[PDB]
Amino acid sequence: SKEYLPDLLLFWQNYEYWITNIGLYKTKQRDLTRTPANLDTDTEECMFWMNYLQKDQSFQLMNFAMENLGALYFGSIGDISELYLRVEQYWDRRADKNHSVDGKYWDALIWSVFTMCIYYMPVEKLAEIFSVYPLHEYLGSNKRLNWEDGMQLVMCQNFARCSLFQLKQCDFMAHPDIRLVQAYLILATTTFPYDEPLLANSLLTQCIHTFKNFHVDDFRPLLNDDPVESIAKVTLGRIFYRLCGCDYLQSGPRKPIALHTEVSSLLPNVDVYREENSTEVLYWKIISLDRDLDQYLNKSSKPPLKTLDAIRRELDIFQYKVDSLEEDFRSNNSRFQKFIALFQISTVSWKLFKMYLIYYDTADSLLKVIHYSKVIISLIVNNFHAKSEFFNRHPMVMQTITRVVSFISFYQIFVESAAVKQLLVDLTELTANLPTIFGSKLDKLVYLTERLSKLKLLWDKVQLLDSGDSFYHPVFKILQNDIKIIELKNDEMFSLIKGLGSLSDFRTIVEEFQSEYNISDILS
Amino acid sequence: SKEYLPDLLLFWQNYEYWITNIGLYKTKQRDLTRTPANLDTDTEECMFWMNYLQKDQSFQLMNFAMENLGALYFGSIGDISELYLRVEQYWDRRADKNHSVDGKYWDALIWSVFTMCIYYMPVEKLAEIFSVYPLHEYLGSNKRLNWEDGMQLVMCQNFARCSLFQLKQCDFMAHPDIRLVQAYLILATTTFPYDEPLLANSLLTQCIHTFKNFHVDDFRPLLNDDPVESIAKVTLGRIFYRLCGCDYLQSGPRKPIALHTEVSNSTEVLYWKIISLDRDLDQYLNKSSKPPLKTLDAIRRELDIFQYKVDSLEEDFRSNNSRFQKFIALFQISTVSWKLFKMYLIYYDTADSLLKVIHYSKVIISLIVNNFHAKSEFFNRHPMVMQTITRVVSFISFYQIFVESAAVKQLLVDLTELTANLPTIFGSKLDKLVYLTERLSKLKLLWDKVQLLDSGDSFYHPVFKILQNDIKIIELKNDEMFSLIKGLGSLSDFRTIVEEFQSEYNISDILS
Amino acid sequence: FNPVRFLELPIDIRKEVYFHLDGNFCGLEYAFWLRYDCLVLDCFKVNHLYDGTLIDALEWTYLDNELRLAYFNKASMLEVWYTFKEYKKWVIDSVANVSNIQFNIDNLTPQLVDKCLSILEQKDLFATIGEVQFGSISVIRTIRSMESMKSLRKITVRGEKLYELLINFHGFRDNPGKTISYIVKRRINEIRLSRMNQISRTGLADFTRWDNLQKLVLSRVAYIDLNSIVFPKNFKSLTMKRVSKIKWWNIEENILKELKVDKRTFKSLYIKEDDSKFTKFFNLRHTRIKELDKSEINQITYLRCQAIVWLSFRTLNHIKLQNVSEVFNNIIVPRALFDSKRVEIYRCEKISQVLVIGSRS
Amino acid sequence: SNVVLVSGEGERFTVDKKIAERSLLLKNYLNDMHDIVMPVPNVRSSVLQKVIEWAEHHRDSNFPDEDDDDSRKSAPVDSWDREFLKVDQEMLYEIILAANYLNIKPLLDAGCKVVAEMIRGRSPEEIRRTFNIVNDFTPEEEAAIRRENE
């Protein structure tokens, strides 16, 4: 019999929630009796990584971001030609021995902008601007590494830490101001929310508290307002919808305080149909389609087909709006905006037809999954060319492939097909050719896929037993115990007790495979 | 006509929400272009102010807390003889070079306990323990200042700041743990929520994040549980109910992330039930609506039930912890009773209301004057008597402005005499309370010397326009739109009397 | 025709087959065997499987001295009829809890409406019934029973005799038994109207009493006036079927009273520049939409124009229009409901002027 | 500039880009980056040739909308479409499967209207009196119905 498949596809939703989503990005094994305390206070380290930079290097980073990366910061900070004055003021106020809170806020904002500049610059321009040598003079690592060898990410993470250190010098908890939130919306474009998810959740809770301090709900200005007040409300609305997007991209069992009062498209105090659609709320609408799909992962109920068909209709509507974006390609900012919107709309299409395949098994759903996987392959391989390799550095290409190359692996364990194997070979070709800036995270993904490849072999050599009621095989036990182990590793009761307390060949094959390929290797 | 009295008593709800609560205690005038961003991050300050404390002095602080302060820390840390081991570990580990995060959490907890010891200690033992002279050698102030001048408040603020500095060395943002909530609830016993208000709001939002990290929503022990887990869930329930209490004691416009999901071992449950009754009373300050009579009658019936429960409580004379608990519980239930009959007087104008207000006001005065003797003077240092006496003297002065009575006048003289006799550990809040009482008395003189007029539809008097402009100025001062604009870019004889009163008796003097 | 390959055919294509096959299951009728087809049970299994977004016209009737579910055609001819245990058994077959069942008053007799309500109340449930179709003894008999009607979400009211008594706020009378009981008005999520001529005559069309409206349907009405109608808090949708000449909002008269500019000079102020990017997808071909020029206005004045547009347009998500054949006062809609596919006009060749305000950036 | 579709059997067909924009998939598979061949699996080449001929017929026809649920009900049974889909049943279902895969709403609507006219006018009391996929029907219930038939 081949009727074990629908319950196993329904088990994929639980496995995708706990292994691929939570346990790979959003779980950090902490142990408070072993972490070193912050007695350095990041003072010597960020003192070095602040006086390492020079002035001409900073203005070249600003010119690079001015002519390339505008689709990321243009909703957050606005127009960056205003910020050249702030860079001049930083390089003039660097010699001052008494700083103000406002000046240090502007300095933290431009250091976050520099962190994004370091994250999205290709290795050739970064080697022509910066020098490899004094970092190896300082960091004490191996003196043979280059920028393409894994030292660009170290400089990016240390610039993010220096932005956070300049936030620490403000007493940012005692002075709530908007330059926290904007700075986090520049730091939420790197892999900073995936490096330290605990610190990202704490800063994001501070950003939610800082935003809700202003008590602004409607960003449509009124008729009895200062013109400055109306421009302030427009910029605050753009910051708000970018903050909602960067807020949904970190959800899970460690993020309890939601900002999600934004009502999704036609199932809620902020109904998102009333704003004039700029880039930021368009990105939020695509993230809202994503969040309306991926709430049924850990839930036991099944999604209605009414909802999935509404998602299909609105998916085609925003698909056509991306075509009718209509900007000038000579400035190439619209090129990167078009890539972001097109990759997100292909991701949401893929998740829609994955849920079509799993929950209801509709007309050629697997074939549409293969088709949109090939579309994602096309949209990533097309940017293997020159001058636009860094387009493959926006973090959503790390998420979506992690959703794809797991699932097409998992289905390959149980249903043998011809197109699926060639698609898996294409994904295995694509996974190694992703940029090396995702580092260890990228490495972990390959390990997961490799484990699933080995999980095909144990499916083949072992015969499926039968009890009449339910089915029994070691693959089922191992896939169950993976979710059991990672749900055990997200239980903070033992942290509470460390706080204020005083403290059959079936089983053999399962213990052999879990002793050989442990799932806890993917935990951060 | 004489119709201004009910609408003016309804105006008192607005004035009591903004001026006596948000303006005096919960508003900090900030300026970001002039405030020194401390690049040192208080390392030079707290390094000295932690080298000032000595070991045997700290153990005498812990002994005083064990003897006399149990009804405060029992909600947060339970028993303090269990904490002596952690104090020993800190004093042995202090001489090291490296440190661990869990140790620094225990250090933040015991420094918060030290702050609670300093804030409630009487002045004679505090003078016998600590010197006065290195304080003025560091601060550069007068050598002739004493503890009653205000140096004990300065030492309390510096210990709170050094506890926060130990929290900042933990990177408590990137490492949530339950000792943050306990070390904040010990710092919530003082007037640290009134020195730095939005810093306390940020710490309380961090504590709400740290609590909801655990995902425990029901605190009852099951059968298949580890008993350690059941003890942990009971203790976490205690911390949750007291955290709801200290959350309600910091509400307002500058704190929108609230924990109040609960609606309406025996002591903490009694304490939260009294505070929740207080919450259901004072939820009608900022609102434009009015409570029904059935609501106030149910509050009165439950008030009599908890009055009998406090009458069912005991007291011990050799154990001062029991008298401290008894005074706190009886003062809380008397404050809730006074606020209930104040709402009776304001909203419905029911007979036998003002006599009940004077009755429970004299009960509050008797509970304070009973502690004016020896051996129990520090009972008046709890923040609830500052809040309660602020509301009482404000409402009695506002009632004396517009309604004359001899018993009310003698009550006002008693409140005014007791107001200057409050201890000097409240300091600037006490001075601004005296200034607000003096401003309302001069407003009474202005009400006396100026005729009330009427154009045929509504009344007109300078007192009404001044009391309205106070609320309008403080609602203008509690807006962050100007800070948002500065963040985005760098972009008749009647009127004469009103402007002279506003130019002489300014409203911005009660702010911070 | 092979009904065994048609059933192994997948779900949504078979749905699209039944989408064009709504009422006419046959084509006078041999109603004995027509119920027990596999295709009819397939229709109702798929119809229960989505939400009820197909035919959905399931009535309670008292036929053959028995209370049973019944489906009526588009011309109100009886197609199928189920005993409730049968329909429960095959809904359980589909799902491997019913709550959406319509209730006419117009397609029934009051001497059996009373018995239907009495035995339906005292028998087991008096629940699982969503819509209530009004449009006078039987009406008052139904009103007395709606207090126990736990899960209803819809009210349809037919022509103007029954509307002004029940729905509009104008009365405020002293008859509690005649009108609603204010617990049924809390869960009243949609309201449809039909078979009338004027909604706002002899008073004012005010919906302020009815809280919690997320949709509204105006069908086959002669003359309405949007300027007269006010709307509740938390109002979402607005759908209008085939109507005659109607008046729209006073938005253009408020822009004309803002800039202090004339009508003919405003007709040279409405640009028609950005009509070839995305509005070609709208497939209008009759209404050429027009916007305001960016060079002929300031920034803050344009934001104030948007603020004037959102006044008397406070909370609305989508406006749906069938053939209306005329609109008097100068359609000028916001782009935030026009740039997405929310403002949807479908069959209007007689309409010509659509103005749209907002940035298309 | 021509666009090549690929069938399931392997025969590569060639149409124009403006012709291929009748499909709501070529319009979103070719619009990746402007700085040519689309595979269609599991479609026999005759079926894709018929779909291509249908797309070449209606090059300048105004179809109603995408979300007009009442214009689909008020059905235009087009003359060339009714002449076109007059094939046997399996060819018709393969065309409808191809139109669902190619995301072409009007051909899907026309095919489903043809199948709806087939299923509407079934033989009364001949095929409707024979239920044939008999499940959730006991022999007791079937015997009860066949006893209630007389």
Numbering used by the authors:
A (entry chain A): 54 to 320, 330 to 565, 588 to 608
B (entry chain B): 54 to 317, 339 to 565, 588 to 608
C (entry chain D): 4 to 30, 88 to 156, 164 to 202, 257 to 482
D (entry chain C): 4 to 38, 75 to 189
From the manuscript:
The centromere binding factor 3 (CBF3) complex binds the third centromere DNA element in organisms with point centromeres, such as S. cerevisiae. It is an essential complex for assembly of the kinetochore in these organisms, as it facilitates genetic centromere specification and allows association of all other kinetochore components. CBF3 comprises two homodimers, of Cep3 and Ndc10, and a Ctf13-Skp1 heterodimer.
In order to identify the binding site for Ndc10 on CBF3CCΔN we assembled a complex of CBF3CCΔN bound to a monomeric construct of Ndc10 comprising domains 1 and 2 (Ndc10 D1-2). Our map of the complex between CBF3CCΔN and Ndc10 D1-2 has excellent density for the core complex and lower resolution for Ndc10, suggesting flexibility between the two. Focused refinement of Ndc10 D1-2 yielded a second map with improved density for Ndc10. The atomic model of CBF3CCΔN fits readily into our composite map, and the remaining density accommodates the crystal structure of S. cerevisiae Ndc10 D1-2. Ndc10 binds to the F box of Ctf13 on the outside of the channel, and two unique structural elements of this atypical F box are responsible for the interaction. Superposition of the crystal structure of DNA-bound Ndc10 D1-2 from the budding yeast Kluyveromyces lactis onto our model indicates that the DNA-binding site of Ndc10 is coplanar with, and approximately perpendicular to, the CBF3CCΔN channel.
